Design an enzyme around this catalytic site. Structure first.
Site, PDB file in Angstrom:
ATOM      1  N   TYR A 120     -21.788 -34.687  -0.005  1.00 32.67           N
ATOM      2  CA  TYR A 120     -23.052 -34.039  -0.312  1.00 32.67           C
ATOM      3  C   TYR A 120     -23.600 -33.432   0.974  1.00 32.67           C
ATOM      4  CZ  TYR A 120     -27.635 -33.321  -2.447  1.00 32.67           C
ATOM      5  OH  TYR A 120     -28.786 -32.760  -2.946  1.00 32.67           O
ATOM      6  N   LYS A 168     -30.750 -26.792  -5.819  1.00 28.97           N
ATOM      7  CA  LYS A 168     -29.316 -26.511  -5.778  1.00 28.97           C
ATOM      8  C   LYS A 168     -28.747 -26.170  -7.151  1.00 28.97           C
ATOM      9  CE  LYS A 168     -28.118 -29.442  -1.777  1.00 28.97           C
ATOM     10  NZ  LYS A 168     -29.511 -29.665  -1.289  1.00 28.97           N
ATOM     11  N   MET A 177     -37.004 -29.830  -4.114  1.00 29.34           N
ATOM     12  CA  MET A 177     -36.029 -30.380  -3.184  1.00 29.34           C
ATOM     13  C   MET A 177     -34.645 -29.972  -3.707  1.00 29.34           C
ATOM     14  SD  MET A 177     -37.355 -31.641  -0.556  1.00 29.34           S
ATOM     15  CE  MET A 177     -38.606 -32.662   0.287  1.00 29.34           C
ATOM     16  N   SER A 178     -33.653 -30.854  -3.640  1.00 30.60           N
ATOM     17  CA  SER A 178     -32.311 -30.484  -4.090  1.00 30.60           C
ATOM     18  C   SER A 178     -32.095 -30.096  -5.551  1.00 30.60           C
ATOM     19  CB  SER A 178     -31.298 -31.556  -3.690  1.00 30.60           C
ATOM     20  OG  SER A 178     -31.019 -31.453  -2.303  1.00 30.60           O
ATOM     21  N   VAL A 179     -33.105 -30.233  -6.402  1.00 30.36           N
ATOM     22  CA  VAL A 179     -32.915 -29.774  -7.773  1.00 30.36           C
ATOM     23  C   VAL A 179     -32.738 -28.253  -7.631  1.00 30.36           C
ATOM     24  CG1 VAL A 179     -34.059 -29.350  -9.981  1.00 30.36           C
ATOM     25  CG2 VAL A 179     -34.110 -31.627  -8.972  1.00 30.36           C
TER      26      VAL A 179
END
EC number: 3.5.1.46
Lengths: 384, 384
Positions: A207, A107, A103-105
């Site tokens: 965010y 990023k 997921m957003s990790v």
């Protein structure tokens, strides 16, 4: 139009191949060796049921740790102290070498690639996004600097109500292939980004997953490499990882940089190890010492107005795709919905990886519990 | 209705998850660990341009072999004599450990799984298809025996004109996710199969990919396992393979048994090795000695009326998903469009794997050239 994009393969025409042309020449030579990029596919195991718990040392200080991990829907948990794996946990049904969506990790990994290019002088964060992606002119990304994208300090009209199909969050997923397309949807991720608008204000943290994909687009324009390849060349291939990572791709082959990466817990920890090693990995330097220092230092505190973060971390901030707690330990972490964390604890030279599947993408409840575990484990690593 | 199918994961509802629900609980716990099964994905290499030619011995007898391989769009070529790799070739851009789509060679793997279940007494080839898949009642598969499916001796109205979207061949691909769906298309592969009709006649060979998928459906009904898992448990996991194989799956998670498997050339050779070893593999017996014997013996010659095969192999036939040349060497082979072959040369106890990407799926020209290479290499292995 979204301009030039890296060809799926050498000499490929724009947007080729598609789900309807991969069997045709000249596309088939490439497609037959990478069909998973075109059609959903399953692994046929070469190997012929119970949770694996090896919490070792910290088990003494945290007797109920396994139960706490179960309560937070933990799939994979790993603690790397220095270069040694001192604690591990994998739910029943999830093997130690299985890969898990970040997921957003994802990023934080994208930001790392950008940092590598900044070190090479290929990207100047002070430059406007349009210096690299002129096609973003006329959008909310017309004016802001690359650094403001890195720090997510751009006001964007981005509806986060995922229950509403018209929301930008749902449209973003459909444009990328994470959900079934609806009539009128942008053709790909690039086009979706060009539709974004805002009041023009910057400076305050907001965010927004679109920011990371804009970074990936910049990476492609500056290197000429598909983001998928750039992520490997500038990061993954230098980690001496056990397994390749994977990343979902849209119809043009563009990797979903903001959240589509999957990898093993142990390999993700190698990213953390690199950060605590001043930007150096076994296969060479990934990012500069300065870049790592800036990540650990944090972003502007005044820009951080997300109460969902500051209620727990009052002096927290965000910079270069990393969340900075600003706590007494200087903890910094990559974070993703449903409980994903690439947590750095510089004090003990440790990295904590927690990959989960909470039923909800986000609730104050889950984060309170998750941060409680990460903080307790961090403290359990302190010298006594 | 197509009846009961193996759940995507333990306790999953019928057809769950879909591209629009995988992020939701309880699906997400499984989905986050197998996202490639839901969304097209690319590998992010953990490793940081020229053809690899190691034709060793046979190079002496076939000086222009590499050129012949290039002429037939060869991606991977491997010769296994006994338990030793005596010759290898990989085009520039294709690594020795890269996986390649098998197309219809996938059918020979499916037939092997069926054979394993016959050995267990779970499948009786003499029984009608409807004994295992009652939902096929009313279709062309209502009446024929499982053996007739295995030997593809069922007359079916199956248009092979792939340029026509209305053709069964194109509709089959769309139903499975190999091509973009059109309004009115069957929801999945199972439903597509139930739409097939024929004049009721049997006994004559008619090559039809639908047959293999019916076999896979039977495998699922008899074992309760997703075909993806059955392919691993009954075959792949017993080969001591270097890498997992992969298989495309439709919207229900049903593997495209007739042609969606991908694997390395070396690993595919392990399947051939098992066949030449009487059905035994390093991880245990895959199929009975009798099954292997029946495959090598061939099918009824009179049923084989495909001039595309008999013009080259007059005494050829087909049985249990394998093509039997009936030539002086008793060659048998798995075959797939665009140049895929899992060729067995029992005389020299050798297996020849050739994975290619001809621009055309099939032409008399390509097959003449391809068979010429396979036969020459086979003869080059003879004692002199």
């Amino acid at each position: 139009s979204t301009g030039q994009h890296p060809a799926r393969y050498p000499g490929a025409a724009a947007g080729e191949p598609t789900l309807d042309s991969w069997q045709e020449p000249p596309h088939n030579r490439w497609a037959f060796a990478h069909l998973g990029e075109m059609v959903p596919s399953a692994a046929v195991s070469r190997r012929p049921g119970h949770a694996l718990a090896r919490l070792g040392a910290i088990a003494a200080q945290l007797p109920d740790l396994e139960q706490r991990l179960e309560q937070t829907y933990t799939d994979a948990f790993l603690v790397l102290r220095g270069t040694e794996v001192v604690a591990e946990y994998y739910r029943a049904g999830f093997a130690p070498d299985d890969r898990h969506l970040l997921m957003s990790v994802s990023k934080s990994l994208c930001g790392t690639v950008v940092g590598a290019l900044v070190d090479e002088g290929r990207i100047d964060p002070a430059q406007p996004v349009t210096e690299y992606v002129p096609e973003l002119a006329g959008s909310v990304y017309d004016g802001p600097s690359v650094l403001q994208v890195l720090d997510m300090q751009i006001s964007i009209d981005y509806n986060e109500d995922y229950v509403d199909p018209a929301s930008e969050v749902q449209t973003h997923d459909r444009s990328a292939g994470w959900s079934t397309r609806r009539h009128g949807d942008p053709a790909d991720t690039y086009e979706f980004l060009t539709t974004l608008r805002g009041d023009g204000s910057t400076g305050e943290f907001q965010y927004c997953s679109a920011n990371t994909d804009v970074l990936a687009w910049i990476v492609e324009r500056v290197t000429g490499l598909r983001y998928v390849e750039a992520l490997s060349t500038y990061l993954w291939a230098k980690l001496d990882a056990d397994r390749d990572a994977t990343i979902t791709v849209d119809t043009t082959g563009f990797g979903f940089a903001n959240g589509g990466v999957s990898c093993t817990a142990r390999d993700l920890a190698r990213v953390g190890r690199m950060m605590l090693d001043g930007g150096v990995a076994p296969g060479g330097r990934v990012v500069s010492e300065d870049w790592v220092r800036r990540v650990l230092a944090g972003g502007s505190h005044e820009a951080m107005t997300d109460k969902g973060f500051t209620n727990t971390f009052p002096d927290g901030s965000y910079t270069r795709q990393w969340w900075c707690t600003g706590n007494e330990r200087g903890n910094v972490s990559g974070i993703g919905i449903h409980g994903q964390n690439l947590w750095l604890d510089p004090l003990t030279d440790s990295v904590i990886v927690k990959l989960s599947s909470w039923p909800d993408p986000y609730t104050e409840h889950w984060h309170r519990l998750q941060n409680g575990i990460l903080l307790d484990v961090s403290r359990a690593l302190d010298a006594v």
